[PDB]
Design a binder for this molecule. Structure first.
Ligand SMILES: *[C@@H]1O[C@H](CO)[C@@H](O[C@@H]2O[C@H](CO)[C@@H](O)[C@H](O)[C@H]2NC(C)=O)[C@H](O)[C@H]1NC(C)=O
Ligand SMILES: *[C@@H]1O[C@H](CO)[C@@H](O)[C@H](O[C@@H]2O[C@@H](C)[C@@H](O)[C@@H](O)[C@@H]2O)[C@H]1NC(C)=O
Ligand SMILES: *[C@@H]1O[C@H](CO)[C@@H](O)[C@H](O)[C@H]1NC(C)=O
Lengths: 260, 247
Protein backbone atom coordinates (compact mmCIF):
# COMPACT_ATOMS: atom_id res chain seq x y z
CA UNK A 1 0.00 0.00 0.00
CA UNK A 2 1.13 3.50 -0.89
CA UNK A 3 0.96 4.72 2.69
CA UNK A 4 3.70 2.25 3.55
CA UNK A 5 6.59 2.49 1.10
CA UNK A 6 9.02 -0.36 1.59
CA UNK A 7 12.09 1.53 0.51
CA UNK A 8 13.45 4.39 -1.50
CA UNK A 9 16.89 5.05 -2.97
CA UNK A 10 18.08 8.62 -3.07
CA UNK A 11 21.19 10.73 -2.51
CA UNK A 12 22.08 12.86 0.51
CA UNK A 13 23.65 16.29 0.07
CA UNK A 14 24.75 18.84 2.59
CA UNK A 15 27.51 21.28 3.23
CA UNK A 16 28.48 23.24 0.17
CA UNK A 17 26.21 21.02 -1.91
CA UNK A 18 28.45 17.96 -1.59
CA UNK A 19 27.18 14.44 -1.25
CA UNK A 20 27.50 11.74 1.44
CA UNK A 21 29.83 9.18 -0.07
CA UNK A 22 31.28 5.84 1.01
CA UNK A 23 34.90 6.61 0.22
CA UNK A 24 36.22 4.51 -2.62
CA UNK A 25 33.11 2.43 -2.63
CA UNK A 26 34.76 0.25 -0.04
CA UNK A 27 32.53 -2.37 1.59
CA UNK A 28 34.44 -3.54 4.58
CA UNK A 29 32.75 -2.95 7.91
CA UNK A 30 33.92 0.37 9.21
CA UNK A 31 34.49 1.91 5.79
CA UNK A 32 34.27 5.66 6.26
CA UNK A 33 31.87 8.11 4.76
CA UNK A 34 32.99 11.52 3.46
CA UNK A 35 31.68 14.48 1.52
CA UNK A 36 32.48 14.44 -2.22
CA UNK A 37 31.13 16.11 -5.36
CA UNK A 38 27.78 14.65 -6.23
CA UNK A 39 27.48 12.06 -8.95
CA UNK A 40 25.62 8.95 -10.05
CA UNK A 41 28.02 6.43 -8.48
CA UNK A 42 26.58 3.66 -6.32
CA UNK A 43 28.55 4.71 -3.30
CA UNK A 44 26.43 7.89 -3.16
CA UNK A 45 23.11 6.06 -3.34
CA UNK A 46 21.39 5.69 -0.02
CA UNK A 47 18.39 3.43 0.46
CA UNK A 48 15.97 4.23 3.23
CA UNK A 49 13.91 1.51 4.93
CA UNK A 50 11.13 1.52 7.54
CA UNK A 51 13.52 0.06 10.07
CA UNK A 52 15.31 3.37 10.38
CA UNK A 53 18.30 2.15 8.43
CA UNK A 54 20.05 4.13 5.65
CA UNK A 55 22.11 1.94 3.39
CA UNK A 56 24.65 2.03 0.63
CA UNK A 57 26.46 -0.83 -1.08
CA UNK A 58 24.24 -3.12 0.97
CA UNK A 59 25.52 -1.87 4.32
CA UNK A 60 24.34 0.52 6.94
CA UNK A 61 25.33 4.06 7.74
CA UNK A 62 26.35 4.25 11.38
CA UNK A 63 28.26 6.15 13.94
CA UNK A 64 31.43 4.45 15.22
CA UNK A 65 31.62 5.60 18.83
CA UNK A 66 29.45 6.79 21.60
CA UNK A 67 31.37 9.99 22.07
CA UNK A 68 31.70 12.72 19.57
CA UNK A 69 34.49 13.02 17.09
CA UNK A 70 34.62 9.65 15.40
CA UNK A 71 33.83 8.82 11.87
CA UNK A 72 30.55 7.85 10.44
CA UNK A 73 30.86 4.63 8.49
CA UNK A 74 29.01 1.78 6.83
CA UNK A 75 28.72 -1.56 8.57
CA UNK A 76 26.96 -4.92 8.44
CA UNK A 77 23.28 -4.27 9.11
CA UNK A 78 23.06 -7.42 11.16
CA UNK A 79 25.11 -5.67 13.80
CA UNK A 80 22.33 -3.13 14.20
CA UNK A 81 19.46 -5.58 14.57
CA UNK A 82 18.86 -4.50 18.15
CA UNK A 83 19.39 -0.84 17.29
CA UNK A 84 16.92 2.00 17.04
CA UNK A 85 18.71 3.63 14.08
CA UNK A 86 18.60 7.08 12.62
CA UNK A 87 16.00 9.75 13.04
CA UNK A 88 15.90 12.70 10.65
CA UNK A 89 14.32 15.90 11.86
CA UNK A 90 12.07 18.03 9.79
CA UNK A 91 14.96 20.47 9.43
CA UNK A 92 17.44 17.94 8.08
CA UNK A 93 19.30 16.95 11.20
CA UNK A 94 20.35 13.29 10.98
CA UNK A 95 20.62 11.83 14.47
CA UNK A 96 21.57 8.49 15.96
CA UNK A 97 18.53 7.80 18.15
CA UNK A 98 20.42 6.22 20.97
CA UNK A 99 23.49 8.42 21.27
CA UNK A 100 22.09 11.64 19.97
CA UNK A 101 25.15 12.33 17.86
CA UNK A 102 24.42 13.87 14.49
CA UNK A 103 25.93 13.57 11.04
CA UNK A 104 28.45 16.35 10.68
CA UNK A 105 31.05 17.73 8.14
CA UNK A 106 33.14 19.28 10.93
CA UNK A 107 36.34 20.54 9.43
CA UNK A 108 37.27 23.95 8.05
CA UNK A 109 36.79 22.47 4.63
CA UNK A 110 33.86 20.39 3.49
CA UNK A 111 36.29 17.98 1.59
CA UNK A 112 36.38 15.97 4.75
CA UNK A 113 35.47 12.85 6.75
CA UNK A 114 31.95 12.87 8.16
CA UNK A 115 31.74 12.35 11.90
CA UNK A 116 29.13 11.95 14.66
CA UNK A 117 29.12 15.13 16.72
CA UNK A 118 27.06 16.88 19.34
CA UNK A 119 24.26 18.78 17.72
CA UNK A 120 24.53 22.55 17.68
CA UNK A 121 22.37 23.19 14.65
CA UNK A 122 25.28 24.26 12.52
CA UNK A 123 24.92 24.40 8.75
CA UNK A 124 27.56 21.68 8.71
CA UNK A 125 25.00 19.48 10.46
CA UNK A 126 22.19 20.15 7.95
CA UNK A 127 21.26 17.78 5.21
CA UNK A 128 18.97 17.46 2.24
CA UNK A 129 17.93 13.90 1.64
CA UNK A 130 16.90 13.73 -1.99
CA UNK A 131 18.03 12.93 -5.47
CA UNK A 132 17.97 16.55 -6.67
CA UNK A 133 21.01 17.99 -5.03
CA UNK A 134 21.37 21.36 -6.67
CA UNK A 135 20.88 24.70 -5.06
CA UNK A 136 17.44 26.05 -5.62
CA UNK A 137 17.35 29.51 -7.13
CA UNK A 138 14.70 31.72 -5.78
CA UNK A 139 13.56 35.13 -4.69
CA UNK A 140 12.53 35.60 -1.04
CA UNK A 141 9.50 37.76 -0.47
CA UNK A 142 8.71 39.52 2.73
CA UNK A 143 6.95 42.52 4.26
CA UNK A 144 5.11 44.82 1.88
CA UNK A 145 5.54 42.24 -0.80
CA UNK A 146 9.16 43.23 -1.18
CA UNK A 147 12.19 41.09 -1.97
CA UNK A 148 15.35 40.44 0.01
CA UNK A 149 18.30 41.93 -1.81
CA UNK A 150 22.06 41.58 -1.34
CA UNK A 151 23.47 45.07 -0.85
CA UNK A 152 26.60 47.02 -0.13
CA UNK A 153 28.84 44.86 -2.27
CA UNK A 154 27.31 41.70 -0.92
CA UNK A 155 27.75 42.55 2.76
CA UNK A 156 24.24 43.53 3.80
CA UNK A 157 20.69 42.50 3.06
CA UNK A 158 17.36 44.24 3.20
CA UNK A 159 14.06 44.52 1.42
CA UNK A 160 13.56 46.35 -1.85
CA UNK A 161 10.74 46.36 -4.40
CA UNK A 162 10.82 43.23 -6.46
CA UNK A 163 12.32 43.60 -9.96
CA UNK A 164 12.31 40.57 -12.19
CA UNK A 165 15.76 39.35 -12.99
CA UNK A 166 17.48 41.93 -10.75
CA UNK A 167 20.54 39.89 -10.02
CA UNK A 168 20.98 40.74 -6.42
CA UNK A 169 17.47 39.68 -5.52
CA UNK A 170 18.24 36.01 -6.28
CA UNK A 171 19.26 33.48 -3.68
CA UNK A 172 20.53 30.00 -3.88
CA UNK A 173 19.10 27.64 -1.34
CA UNK A 174 21.68 24.99 -0.55
CA UNK A 175 21.39 21.51 0.87
CA UNK A 176 22.99 22.62 4.09
CA UNK A 177 20.25 25.11 4.79
CA UNK A 178 22.31 28.08 3.75
CA UNK A 179 20.90 30.98 1.80
CA UNK A 180 23.53 32.10 -0.69
CA UNK A 181 24.07 35.10 -2.92
CA UNK A 182 23.10 33.59 -6.24
CA UNK A 183 25.93 35.11 -8.18
CA UNK A 184 28.53 34.64 -5.49
CA UNK A 185 27.97 31.31 -3.91
CA UNK A 186 30.73 31.66 -1.40
CA UNK A 187 28.61 34.24 0.50
CA UNK A 188 25.84 33.33 2.90
CA UNK A 189 23.11 35.14 4.81
CA UNK A 190 24.23 35.19 8.38
CA UNK A 191 22.95 36.11 11.76
CA UNK A 192 25.11 38.56 13.64
CA UNK A 193 28.50 37.49 14.99
CA UNK A 194 28.61 40.58 17.28
CA UNK A 195 26.50 40.15 20.39
CA UNK A 196 25.74 43.85 20.42
CA UNK A 197 23.83 43.63 17.17
CA UNK A 198 20.90 41.58 16.00
CA UNK A 199 21.42 42.55 12.39
CA UNK A 200 21.40 39.90 9.69
CA UNK A 201 24.18 40.36 7.19
CA UNK A 202 26.09 38.53 4.42
CA UNK A 203 29.38 36.83 5.20
CA UNK A 204 31.69 34.23 3.79
CA UNK A 205 30.21 30.75 4.14
CA UNK A 206 31.68 28.94 7.09
CA UNK A 207 29.26 26.23 8.10
CA UNK A 208 28.20 27.96 11.25
CA UNK A 209 25.02 28.05 13.24
CA UNK A 210 24.66 31.66 12.12
CA UNK A 211 24.19 30.53 8.58
CA UNK A 212 21.66 27.72 8.92
CA UNK A 213 18.12 28.70 8.00
CA UNK A 214 14.96 26.67 7.94
CA UNK A 215 11.93 27.69 5.86
CA UNK A 216 9.13 26.55 8.08
CA UNK A 217 5.62 25.62 7.07
CA UNK A 218 4.33 28.42 9.27
CA UNK A 219 6.05 30.90 7.05
CA UNK A 220 9.06 31.94 8.99
CA UNK A 221 12.79 31.69 8.23
CA UNK A 222 14.15 30.10 11.32
CA UNK A 223 17.58 29.81 12.83
CA UNK A 224 17.15 26.66 14.92
CA UNK A 225 20.34 26.94 16.84
CA UNK A 226 19.48 30.39 18.02
CA UNK A 227 15.78 29.65 18.48
CA UNK A 228 14.88 32.72 16.52
CA UNK A 229 13.57 33.89 13.15
CA UNK A 230 14.22 36.52 10.49
CA UNK A 231 12.29 39.70 11.07
CA UNK A 232 11.98 43.13 9.54
CA UNK A 233 13.25 45.65 12.05
CA UNK A 234 10.31 47.42 13.72
CA UNK A 235 8.10 46.08 10.95
CA UNK A 236 9.42 48.92 8.86
CA UNK A 237 10.93 48.07 5.51
CA UNK A 238 12.38 51.53 5.13
CA UNK A 239 14.80 50.99 7.96
CA UNK A 240 16.73 48.63 5.70
CA UNK A 241 17.39 46.23 8.50
CA UNK A 242 16.53 42.58 8.91
CA UNK A 243 17.17 41.14 12.37
CA UNK A 244 17.03 37.92 14.30
CA UNK A 245 14.10 37.87 16.74
CA UNK A 246 12.15 35.52 18.93
CA UNK A 247 9.04 34.36 17.10
CA UNK A 248 6.00 36.53 17.79
CA UNK A 249 2.54 36.95 16.28
CA UNK A 250 2.68 40.78 16.49
CA UNK A 251 3.06 42.32 13.02
CA UNK A 252 3.80 40.63 9.68
CA UNK A 253 7.57 41.08 9.59
CA UNK A 254 8.33 37.46 10.35
CA UNK A 255 6.43 36.12 7.33
CA UNK A 256 8.22 35.25 4.13
CA UNK A 257 7.57 33.46 0.84
CA UNK A 258 9.88 31.50 -1.43
CA UNK A 259 9.23 32.40 -5.07
CA UNK A 260 11.17 30.12 -7.39
CA UNK B 1 -19.18 34.63 4.94
CA UNK B 2 -15.53 35.23 4.28
CA UNK B 3 -15.53 37.49 1.29
CA UNK B 4 -13.61 39.41 -1.32
CA UNK B 5 -14.93 42.31 -3.38
CA UNK B 6 -13.49 43.85 -6.53
CA UNK B 7 -14.07 47.29 -5.08
CA UNK B 8 -11.32 46.66 -2.61
CA UNK B 9 -9.03 44.22 -4.33
CA UNK B 10 -5.42 44.92 -3.52
CA UNK B 11 -2.50 42.71 -2.85
CA UNK B 12 -3.08 43.28 0.85
CA UNK B 13 -6.75 42.40 0.84
CA UNK B 14 -6.18 39.39 -1.42
CA UNK B 15 -3.46 38.13 0.86
CA UNK B 16 -5.71 38.52 3.88
CA UNK B 17 -8.49 36.70 2.13
CA UNK B 18 -6.27 33.77 1.25
CA UNK B 19 -4.80 33.71 4.76
CA UNK B 20 -8.24 33.56 6.25
CA UNK B 21 -9.47 30.98 3.80
CA UNK B 22 -6.58 28.71 4.81
CA UNK B 23 -7.43 29.29 8.45
CA UNK B 24 -10.98 28.33 8.00
CA UNK B 25 -10.21 25.23 5.99
CA UNK B 26 -7.68 24.11 8.55
CA UNK B 27 -9.91 24.24 11.56
CA UNK B 28 -9.61 20.79 13.07
CA UNK B 29 -6.83 19.72 10.80
CA UNK B 30 -4.34 17.03 11.74
CA UNK B 31 -0.56 17.44 11.65
CA UNK B 32 2.40 15.23 11.00
CA UNK B 33 6.16 15.68 11.07
CA UNK B 34 6.18 18.11 8.28
CA UNK B 35 3.96 20.48 10.16
CA UNK B 36 1.71 21.09 7.20
CA UNK B 37 -1.94 20.81 8.13
CA UNK B 38 -3.98 17.95 6.80
CA UNK B 39 -7.58 18.74 5.94
CA UNK B 40 -10.44 17.06 7.80
CA UNK B 41 -11.88 13.74 6.62
CA UNK B 42 -15.16 11.86 7.03
CA UNK B 43 -16.90 15.16 7.75
CA UNK B 44 -20.68 14.93 8.21
CA UNK B 45 -22.47 16.44 5.21
CA UNK B 46 -24.23 19.10 7.30
CA UNK B 47 -20.60 20.45 7.90
CA UNK B 48 -18.75 19.75 4.98
CA UNK B 49 -19.01 23.11 3.26
CA UNK B 50 -17.37 26.45 3.72
CA UNK B 51 -19.11 29.32 2.00
CA UNK B 52 -17.25 32.25 0.58
CA UNK B 53 -18.63 35.25 -1.18
CA UNK B 54 -17.06 37.02 -4.19
CA UNK B 55 -18.39 40.33 -5.46
CA UNK B 56 -17.67 41.75 -8.93
CA UNK B 57 -17.36 45.33 -10.12
CA UNK B 58 -21.12 45.68 -10.51
CA UNK B 59 -21.85 44.89 -6.90
CA UNK B 60 -23.04 41.39 -7.98
CA UNK B 61 -22.20 38.58 -5.60
CA UNK B 62 -21.85 34.82 -5.82
CA UNK B 63 -21.47 32.40 -2.94
CA UNK B 64 -19.24 29.42 -3.57
CA UNK B 65 -19.39 26.28 -1.53
CA UNK B 66 -16.05 24.70 -0.84
CA UNK B 67 -15.78 21.08 0.28
CA UNK B 68 -13.62 21.24 3.43
CA UNK B 69 -12.28 17.77 2.81
CA UNK B 70 -10.59 18.61 -0.49
CA UNK B 71 -10.66 22.33 -0.99
CA UNK B 72 -12.61 22.06 -4.18
CA UNK B 73 -15.82 23.81 -5.22
CA UNK B 74 -19.01 21.78 -5.07
CA UNK B 75 -21.50 24.43 -6.07
CA UNK B 76 -22.36 28.05 -6.06
CA UNK B 77 -25.25 30.41 -5.67
CA UNK B 78 -26.20 33.53 -7.60
CA UNK B 79 -29.26 35.39 -6.34
CA UNK B 80 -32.00 32.79 -6.21
CA UNK B 81 -30.28 30.27 -8.39
CA UNK B 82 -27.69 27.61 -7.55
CA UNK B 83 -25.49 25.34 -9.60
CA UNK B 84 -23.95 22.05 -8.56
CA UNK B 85 -21.21 20.08 -10.19
CA UNK B 86 -22.14 16.58 -11.38
CA UNK B 87 -19.63 15.17 -8.97
CA UNK B 88 -20.72 17.24 -6.01
CA UNK B 89 -21.46 14.97 -2.98
CA UNK B 90 -24.89 13.44 -3.76
CA UNK B 91 -26.52 14.82 -0.63
CA UNK B 92 -25.14 18.33 -0.94
CA UNK B 93 -28.28 19.77 -2.49
CA UNK B 94 -30.18 19.10 0.74
CA UNK B 95 -27.63 20.98 2.78
CA UNK B 96 -26.62 24.01 0.84
CA UNK B 97 -28.52 26.56 -1.14
CA UNK B 98 -31.80 24.87 -0.29
CA UNK B 99 -33.90 27.96 -0.77
CA UNK B 100 -32.93 28.44 -4.41
CA UNK B 101 -33.71 27.09 -7.80
CA UNK B 102 -31.08 24.34 -8.09
CA UNK B 103 -29.35 23.25 -11.25
CA UNK B 104 -26.85 20.61 -12.09
CA UNK B 105 -23.91 21.51 -14.33
CA UNK B 106 -23.12 18.80 -16.87
CA UNK B 107 -19.54 18.36 -15.79
CA UNK B 108 -17.29 17.65 -12.84
CA UNK B 109 -15.33 20.09 -10.70
CA UNK B 110 -12.03 18.75 -11.97
CA UNK B 111 -9.73 20.55 -14.31
CA UNK B 112 -9.83 17.67 -16.73
CA UNK B 113 -13.59 17.73 -16.98
CA UNK B 114 -13.86 21.46 -17.09
CA UNK B 115 -11.27 21.75 -19.83
CA UNK B 116 -13.00 19.13 -21.93
CA UNK B 117 -16.36 20.79 -21.66
CA UNK B 118 -15.09 24.22 -22.27
CA UNK B 119 -12.61 23.29 -24.93
CA UNK B 120 -9.93 25.48 -23.38
CA UNK B 121 -7.03 24.59 -21.12
CA UNK B 122 -5.50 26.30 -18.18
CA UNK B 123 -2.41 27.20 -20.23
CA UNK B 124 -4.49 29.25 -22.52
CA UNK B 125 -6.66 30.92 -19.90
CA UNK B 126 -5.47 34.27 -18.64
CA UNK B 127 -5.53 35.07 -14.94
CA UNK B 128 -5.53 38.49 -13.39
CA UNK B 129 -7.80 41.26 -12.21
CA UNK B 130 -9.95 41.54 -15.28
CA UNK B 131 -10.40 37.79 -15.32
CA UNK B 132 -11.31 37.45 -11.69
CA UNK B 133 -13.95 40.13 -12.06
CA UNK B 134 -15.29 38.75 -15.27
CA UNK B 135 -15.43 35.26 -13.94
CA UNK B 136 -17.59 36.31 -11.06
CA UNK B 137 -19.86 38.04 -13.55
CA UNK B 138 -20.04 35.06 -15.93
CA UNK B 139 -20.96 32.84 -13.04
CA UNK B 140 -23.47 35.33 -11.64
CA UNK B 141 -25.44 35.38 -14.84
CA UNK B 142 -24.51 31.80 -15.67
CA UNK B 143 -23.43 32.49 -19.24
CA UNK B 144 -22.88 28.89 -20.35
CA UNK B 145 -20.23 29.66 -22.87
CA UNK B 146 -18.07 31.24 -20.18
CA UNK B 147 -18.83 29.10 -17.13
CA UNK B 148 -16.06 26.58 -17.66
CA UNK B 149 -13.28 29.14 -18.11
CA UNK B 150 -14.72 31.12 -15.21
CA UNK B 151 -14.18 28.14 -12.98
CA UNK B 152 -10.69 27.64 -14.33
CA UNK B 153 -9.98 31.19 -13.29
CA UNK B 154 -11.60 31.14 -9.86
CA UNK B 155 -10.48 27.73 -8.86
CA UNK B 156 -6.93 28.75 -9.47
CA UNK B 157 -7.05 32.27 -8.11
CA UNK B 158 -8.83 31.23 -4.99
CA UNK B 159 -8.43 27.54 -4.18
CA UNK B 160 -5.14 26.65 -5.78
CA UNK B 161 -3.77 29.91 -4.33
CA UNK B 162 -4.94 28.72 -0.92
CA UNK B 163 -3.23 25.42 -1.44
CA UNK B 164 0.10 26.88 -2.58
CA UNK B 165 1.94 30.00 -1.54
CA UNK B 166 3.71 30.02 -4.86
CA UNK B 167 0.34 30.39 -6.64
CA UNK B 168 -0.84 32.98 -4.18
CA UNK B 169 2.35 34.90 -4.97
CA UNK B 170 1.72 34.76 -8.71
CA UNK B 171 -1.67 36.23 -8.19
CA UNK B 172 -0.24 38.93 -5.91
CA UNK B 173 2.22 39.88 -8.61
CA UNK B 174 -0.65 40.07 -11.09
CA UNK B 175 -2.55 42.44 -8.85
CA UNK B 176 0.36 44.64 -7.94
CA UNK B 177 1.54 45.10 -11.49
CA UNK B 178 -1.86 44.77 -13.08
CA UNK B 179 -0.20 42.23 -15.36
CA UNK B 180 -2.25 39.23 -16.47
CA UNK B 181 -0.62 35.86 -16.87
CA UNK B 182 -1.20 32.27 -17.86
CA UNK B 183 0.02 29.54 -15.60
CA UNK B 184 3.24 27.91 -16.63
CA UNK B 185 4.75 24.57 -15.76
CA UNK B 186 5.63 25.63 -12.25
CA UNK B 187 2.07 26.49 -11.33
CA UNK B 188 0.50 23.65 -13.23
CA UNK B 189 2.85 21.08 -11.69
CA UNK B 190 1.68 22.11 -8.26
CA UNK B 191 -1.98 21.89 -9.14
CA UNK B 192 -1.41 18.53 -10.74
CA UNK B 193 0.39 17.04 -7.83
CA UNK B 194 -1.43 18.32 -4.80
CA UNK B 195 -2.97 14.94 -3.97
CA UNK B 196 0.20 13.07 -4.77
CA UNK B 197 2.28 15.36 -2.56
CA UNK B 198 -0.27 14.90 0.17
CA UNK B 199 0.05 11.14 -0.07
CA UNK B 200 3.85 11.16 -0.19
CA UNK B 201 4.26 13.54 2.66
CA UNK B 202 2.03 11.47 4.88
CA UNK B 203 3.52 8.21 3.77
CA UNK B 204 7.01 9.53 4.46
CA UNK B 205 6.42 9.38 8.19
CA UNK B 206 7.56 5.78 8.09
CA UNK B 207 10.60 6.50 5.94
CA UNK B 208 12.42 9.31 7.74
CA UNK B 209 10.75 11.89 5.52
CA UNK B 210 11.60 10.22 2.27
CA UNK B 211 8.88 9.66 -0.26
CA UNK B 212 7.80 6.44 -1.92
CA UNK B 213 7.72 8.19 -5.29
CA UNK B 214 9.29 11.30 -6.64
CA UNK B 215 7.17 14.25 -7.75
CA UNK B 216 8.29 16.64 -10.44
CA UNK B 217 7.74 20.29 -9.60
CA UNK B 218 8.88 22.77 -12.19
CA UNK B 219 10.57 26.02 -11.46
CA UNK B 220 10.05 29.38 -13.21
CA UNK B 221 12.81 28.51 -15.67
CA UNK B 222 10.87 25.43 -16.74
CA UNK B 223 13.33 23.08 -15.08
CA UNK B 224 11.88 20.05 -13.27
CA UNK B 225 12.93 19.62 -9.72
CA UNK B 226 12.50 16.19 -8.30
CA UNK B 227 10.86 16.24 -4.95
CA UNK B 228 11.40 12.84 -3.36
CA UNK B 229 11.38 13.90 0.27
CA UNK B 230 10.03 16.54 2.59
CA UNK B 231 13.36 18.26 2.58
CA UNK B 232 12.67 20.70 -0.26
CA UNK B 233 11.71 24.29 0.58
CA UNK B 234 9.73 24.54 -2.63
CA UNK B 235 7.36 22.09 -1.07
CA UNK B 236 7.48 22.63 2.65
CA UNK B 237 7.27 26.36 2.61
CA UNK B 238 4.76 26.35 -0.25
CA UNK B 239 1.99 23.80 0.09
CA UNK B 240 -0.25 25.25 2.80
CA UNK B 241 -2.40 22.23 3.54
CA UNK B 242 -2.87 18.66 2.36
CA UNK B 243 -5.57 16.21 1.48
CA UNK B 244 -6.05 13.45 4.05
CA UNK B 245 -4.44 10.33 2.68
CA UNK B 246 -2.93 8.08 5.35
CA UNK B 247 -4.08 6.79 8.71
C1 LIG C 1 23.94 4.70 17.32
O1 LIG C 1 24.81 4.86 18.40
C2 LIG C 1 24.88 3.74 19.26
C3 LIG C 1 25.63 4.11 20.50
O2 LIG C 1 26.92 4.56 20.18
C4 LIG C 1 25.48 2.55 18.52
O3 LIG C 1 25.43 1.38 19.33
C5 LIG C 1 26.64 0.61 19.39
O4 LIG C 1 26.67 -0.34 18.37
C6 LIG C 1 27.81 -1.16 18.21
C7 LIG C 1 27.42 -2.12 17.11
O5 LIG C 1 26.02 -2.39 17.21
C8 LIG C 1 28.09 -1.96 19.45
O6 LIG C 1 29.42 -2.38 19.53
C9 LIG C 1 27.90 -1.12 20.68
O7 LIG C 1 27.85 -2.02 21.79
C10 LIG C 1 26.67 -0.26 20.65
N1 LIG C 1 26.90 0.55 21.79
C11 LIG C 1 25.95 1.00 22.57
C12 LIG C 1 26.48 1.90 23.64
O8 LIG C 1 24.79 0.72 22.43
C13 LIG C 1 24.65 2.30 17.27
O9 LIG C 1 25.27 1.33 16.47
C14 LIG C 1 24.45 3.58 16.45
N2 LIG C 1 23.59 3.33 15.34
C15 LIG C 1 23.71 4.02 14.22
C16 LIG C 1 22.75 3.60 13.17
O10 LIG C 1 24.47 4.90 14.06
C1 LIG D 1 39.62 10.65 8.04
O1 LIG D 1 39.50 9.32 8.54
C2 LIG D 1 40.70 8.55 8.49
C3 LIG D 1 40.40 7.10 8.86
O2 LIG D 1 39.81 7.02 10.16
C4 LIG D 1 41.77 9.22 9.35
O3 LIG D 1 42.99 8.50 9.36
C5 LIG D 1 42.07 10.58 8.77
O4 LIG D 1 43.00 11.24 9.63
C6 LIG D 1 44.01 11.86 8.83
O5 LIG D 1 45.01 10.95 8.46
C7 LIG D 1 45.80 10.42 9.49
C8 LIG D 1 46.77 9.44 8.87
C9 LIG D 1 46.50 11.56 10.22
O6 LIG D 1 47.43 12.32 9.43
C10 LIG D 1 45.42 12.50 10.71
O7 LIG D 1 45.98 13.62 11.41
C11 LIG D 1 44.64 13.02 9.54
O8 LIG D 1 43.68 13.88 10.10
C12 LIG D 1 40.81 11.42 8.64
N1 LIG D 1 41.10 12.65 7.92
C13 LIG D 1 41.32 12.79 6.59
C14 LIG D 1 41.31 14.20 6.08
O9 LIG D 1 41.52 11.89 5.82
C1 LIG E 1 -17.17 12.77 -13.02
O1 LIG E 1 -16.90 12.21 -11.77
C2 LIG E 1 -17.26 10.86 -11.50
C3 LIG E 1 -16.40 10.41 -10.35
O2 LIG E 1 -16.84 11.02 -9.16
C4 LIG E 1 -16.92 9.90 -12.61
O3 LIG E 1 -17.69 8.72 -12.45
C5 LIG E 1 -17.30 10.43 -13.95
O4 LIG E 1 -16.65 9.52 -14.83
C6 LIG E 1 -16.85 11.86 -14.18
N1 LIG E 1 -17.67 12.38 -15.25
C7 LIG E 1 -17.28 13.14 -16.23
C8 LIG E 1 -18.38 13.92 -16.88
O5 LIG E 1 -16.12 13.18 -16.57
Amino acid sequence: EQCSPQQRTTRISGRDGLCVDVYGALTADGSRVILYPCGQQQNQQWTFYPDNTIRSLGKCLATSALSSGSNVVITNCDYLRYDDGWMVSSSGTMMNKSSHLVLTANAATSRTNLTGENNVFAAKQAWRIGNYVEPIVTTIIGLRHMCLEATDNDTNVWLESCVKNKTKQYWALYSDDTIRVNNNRNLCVSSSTDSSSKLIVIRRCDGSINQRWVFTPQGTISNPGYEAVMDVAQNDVYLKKIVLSSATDKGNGQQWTVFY
Amino acid sequence: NLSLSQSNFSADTYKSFIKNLRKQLTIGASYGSAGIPILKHSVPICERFLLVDLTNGDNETITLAINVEDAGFAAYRAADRSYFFQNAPPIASYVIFTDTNQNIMNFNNTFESIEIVGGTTRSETPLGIMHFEASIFHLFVHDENYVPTSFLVLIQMVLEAAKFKFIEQKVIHSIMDMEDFTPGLAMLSLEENWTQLSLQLQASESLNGVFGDSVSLYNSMDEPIGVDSMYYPILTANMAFQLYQCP
